Amino acid sequence: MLDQQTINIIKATVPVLKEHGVTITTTFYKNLFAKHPEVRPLFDMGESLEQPKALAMTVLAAAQNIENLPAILPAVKKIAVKHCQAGVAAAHYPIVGQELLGAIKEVLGDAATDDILDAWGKAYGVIADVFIQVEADLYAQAVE
Amino acid sequence: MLDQQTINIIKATVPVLKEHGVTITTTFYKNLFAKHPEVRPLFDMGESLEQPKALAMTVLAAAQNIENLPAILPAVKKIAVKHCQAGVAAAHYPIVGQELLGAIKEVLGDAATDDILDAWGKAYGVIADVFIQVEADLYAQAVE
Numbered sequence A, B: 001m002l003d004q005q006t007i008n009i010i011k012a013t014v015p016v017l018k019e020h021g022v023t024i025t026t027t028f029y030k031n032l033f034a035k036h037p038e039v040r041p042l043f044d045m046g047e048s049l050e051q052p053k054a055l056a057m058t059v060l061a062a063a064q065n066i067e068n069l070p071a072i073l074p075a076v077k078k079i080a081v082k083h084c085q086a087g088v089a090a091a092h093y094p095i096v097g098q099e100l101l102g103a104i105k106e107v108l109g110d111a112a113t114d115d116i117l118d119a120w121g122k123a124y125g126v127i128a129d130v131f132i133q134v135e136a137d138l139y140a141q142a143v144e
C-alpha cells in the first residue's frame, strides 16, 4: 500500500485541487480527447461528445478517503456498472491517470514538485485498482 | 494503511497459520464462546451452538490478499449480508480479533514474537474495517 508521506501529500493537497476543480476537469477532458482519440467512442452519445463532468472530481473525493476506501464503495459500484456497460478496460486507466496528472501539474504550477506528482500518481493507481477489480468481477459475473 | 514490514510478516506467516488451521479455528471458537457469552445468541440455531468453521480461515484468506482487498469483495459482500442478518456490530470485531490473536499465539508458540502478533493485530483491524464499512452501508440501505 501507500506510505505515510504519500498519504500526507494527498490529504494536504487534495483541498487545493478541489478549489481549482473547474480547471482540473476541463484540462483533463481537453487533453484526454485530443491525445487519445481511441477513447472518444466510449463517450459518444445518441450531439457533442459527453464529458461526465464528475470523473476527475470523483478521483479527488476517493483520494480524500484514501485511508478508508471501503466507504466509497456504494458510489464505486454504481460507477463500475456504467463503466462495464460502456466498455471500460483496465488498460484505459493509465491513460486517464496520465491526463489527470497533467491537469494536476497545470493547477499546482510552482507547487508541482516531483514528489507531489509522484504521490498523486501512486494514489490514482490505488484508486484505479479498486475500480479495475470491481469491474473485473462485474464482467465475470455477466457470463455466469 | 499498513507499513511494509507488517505486510511482510503477514505474507511470510499466513501460510504457517494456514497449515495449522484446525488449531486456529478450534482454539478461536473455544475461547470466543467461553470468554464472551454475550455473543453466543448470534450463533444460536433453530441444537448445539453453530461454529461457522470458515470464520478464522477467511480472515487468513483476506490477509493473503492484503495488498488487493477489493479482490475478496464478492465474498465479503455475501458474508456481510449474513452478518447484518445475524446482528453483527462494529463493537464485536475487537472481541473476535482478540480471540483470533490468542489462537495465533498458541499456534506460533516460540515464533510468537511481539512484533509478529502486533502485525496480525494491525492486519485484522484493516480486514475488520472492510467488513464494518460494508455492513454499515448495508444496515443504512435497509431503512431506505
Ligand code: HEM
Pocket: A039, A042, A043, A050, A052, A054, A055, A056, A058, A059, A079, A082, A083, A085, A086, A088, A089, A092, A093, A094, A096, A127, A128, A131
Ligand atoms: C479512478 C478512475 C475513474 C473514476 C473515479 C471515474 C468516475 C466516473 C464518474 C463519476 C462517471 C459518471 C457516472 C455517472 O454519474 O453515471 C464516469 C463515467 C464514465 N467514465 Fe469513468 N472514471 C474513472 C476512470 C475511467 C476510465 C479509465 C475510463 C476509460 C475510458 C472511463 C470512462 C468513462 C465513460 C465512457 C463514462 C460514461 C458512462 C456513460 O455515460 O454511460 N472512466 N466515470
Ligand code: HEM
Pocket: B039, B042, B043, B050, B052, B054, B055, B056, B058, B059, B079, B082, B083, B085, B086, B088, B089, B092, B093, B094, B096, B127, B128, B131
Ligand atoms: C474479519 C472478521 C470476520 C470474518 C472474516 C468472518 C467470516 C465469516 C464467515 C466466512 C462466515 C460463514 C458465512 C457463510 O458461509 O454463510 C461467518 C458467519 C458468521 N459470523 Fe463472521 N466473520 C468475521 C467477524 C465476525 C464478528 C465480529 C462476529 C460477531 C459476533 C461474527 C459473527 C458471525 C455469525 C453470528 C455468523 C453466522 C451467520 C449465520 O449463521 O447466519 N463474525 N463469518
